[PDB]
Amino acid sequence: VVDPFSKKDWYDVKAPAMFNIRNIGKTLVTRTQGTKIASDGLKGRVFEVSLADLQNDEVAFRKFKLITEDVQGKNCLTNFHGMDLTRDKMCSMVKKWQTMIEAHVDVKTTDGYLLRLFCVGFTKKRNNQIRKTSYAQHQQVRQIRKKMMEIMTREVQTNDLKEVVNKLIPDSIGKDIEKACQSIYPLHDVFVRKVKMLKKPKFELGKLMELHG
């Protein structure tokens, strides 16, 4: 008999300052009723917004899970949580007559943010290759995976989550993987397909202020 959407109030989810688009949308939460507080209700909210909504001229087939953790009175400040490729680019990549090279590490940032850098790569049929398939032998796909876990541990352990997501916007990791690993087997379309988030140290308020500027 009562509309529950009268007691709901809106908030502006504000992205961090690593991008060009700062405000990304709205959210809904009920008001506080004394026993519970609406900041706790809006605490565990993830936001799987794509990259074309955060930067203008970039690609669109990448995603970014964004947990919000600060509310500032009609201002919801969010933090980077995870990364993912869209499920159309993934199934577009996987053809038949080539190999898929998978890799993952549990790499650690300098502030303590235990990430998990998944990876994926595919071999490249040449320009004049009459031959039908292009697979790779087992020590070749073990040496590509060896050079993958090298670079996605030496590009993360030297930094914290400031510079890692600046590298993740043009995806410099894959553009270094293929450029480093042409000399083993030519990789074709190599990305980081997922970034998870294993465990986080306790939140400090002034640090997220630096991430929004």
Partner: protein, 132 residues
């Protein structure tokens, strides 16, 4: 529908092949000559032979037809087949050989031929179709 059986088409084909000079485009003067050439049991077959003939005479202006053979085309094809050009297409002053062709001619002691102009061989060994 209106399909002409083997009797109409066989009779029309022979009467074109033997009497092409008298037949033209008018169905009526075709009927008046198809009843003076041939002995057809009468009209409803006579007008069907003369109609396929009137459809078959229009088909001869646009070229030959794969059945009958008439001697106004088969003299023009004969004068088209006895056609030699003035200077032949095999009289070329600069003919192009490969490197390896010149080696075969040197095996046949024809390395002293002057008209041969050896081309640069192809840089890539790329000739097979891309299987898959």
């Amino acid at each position: 529908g209106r399909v002409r059986t083997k009797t109409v088409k066989k009779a029309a084909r022979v009467i074109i092949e033997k009497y092409y000079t008298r037949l033209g485009n008018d169905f009526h003067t075709n009927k008046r000559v198809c009843e003076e050439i041939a002995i057809i049991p009468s009209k409803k077959l006579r007008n069907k032979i003369a109609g396929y003939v009137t459809h078959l005479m229009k088909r001869i202006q646009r070229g030959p037809v794969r059945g009958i053979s008439i001697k106004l085309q088969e003299e023009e094809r004969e004068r088209r087949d006895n056609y030699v050009p003035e200077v032949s297409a095999l009289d070329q002053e600069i003919i192009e050989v490969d490197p390896d062709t010149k080696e075969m001619l040197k095996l046949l002691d024809f390395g002293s031929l002057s008209n041969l102009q050896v081309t640069q061989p192809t840089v890539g060994m790329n000739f097979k179709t891309p299987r898959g």
